[PDB]
């Protein structure tokens, strides 16, 4: 089974390449590992702005291994002022029993949005009270992933499938109970959980 | 985790509905199934001719359930005389968990589901009309049924069949394949049969072309 260093990756617009690494963790067979590109929309894209190589390679029983995410010269026609979605594809192909295949969130995101150090730009998230939710309003120029809503902080905790993904600078319109004090779960650029807390004013809360 | 009760999928033709089962192996936490349907092309299609239902389903911990395969009146398009190549999709949905050894990202897997119109349905061995016929740096493997073989393997000798790793040969209905490899005064070939077997085949090669 190949396994991924990560659960989603930040290509920091700045680099013109990043690597990846992967790994064989079976120590008796190997497997063959195909690495692909999607755009937001999930479908296949094999002239860039951005690729992976090597497209296929054979991993050697325990051996490790890594995938170059590089960018080409049309990268400068994606947005210079908000995150762009791509997805990093992996497939492994198991010797001679049926091949299985991950993809992870791939943010490229532009030098010009490069975050300052300890910066919590999920801050600036915005709650509407709707009919039966919340219309979550994120003005920041990146895709902030929310796992859970609750009414404590550890009742934003306990969610199973409340996953809901924002654009930047968008809104959504979540199926949510409404609750007094509003505490936001969500996960940040290396996989920390934390959770921001809102103090409503009517319809509209704010951190 | 879910698990597929198959490898590959045959769907008959005479029939409406088929179903698969999947269960969750995990006895502690709670898992999504997403499931759908590819063309050959590996494109998602909605509209028919063969449809997954439900496209997604709760599975509790240590539940087994199943997805409906079925047809739409435009099922009747596709070609009578040879098979039409389908992907069954499944996708499995973690729950949120701060368990290390639980996997917090979707794992997802496509078998082969082969459409096999009621008239070229089937203990019948239809894998030896494979015609073997010896070109430079290989052989030319020709398809002249109706159906689709996975070659696996192509060697010297029966174990030399069963060596292969990753050669996988797919062969259209009526098709045929080159294929680089060694030159065999014996050539013994590997393919998968529908219910995931693995039958190897012994081949006479009189000049040019070779046969079982």
Redesign the interface.
Known sequence: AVSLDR?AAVFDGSEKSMTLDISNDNKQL?Y?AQAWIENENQEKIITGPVIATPPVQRLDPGAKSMVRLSTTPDISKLPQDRESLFYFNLRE?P??????????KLFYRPAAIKTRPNEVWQDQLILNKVSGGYRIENPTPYYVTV??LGGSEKQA?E?????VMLSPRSEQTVKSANYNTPYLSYINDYGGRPVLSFICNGSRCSV
């Open positions: 659960t190997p063959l192909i010797p001679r029993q049926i091949a299985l295949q991950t993809k992870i796992i859970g905790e969610g199973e499938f409340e996953t």
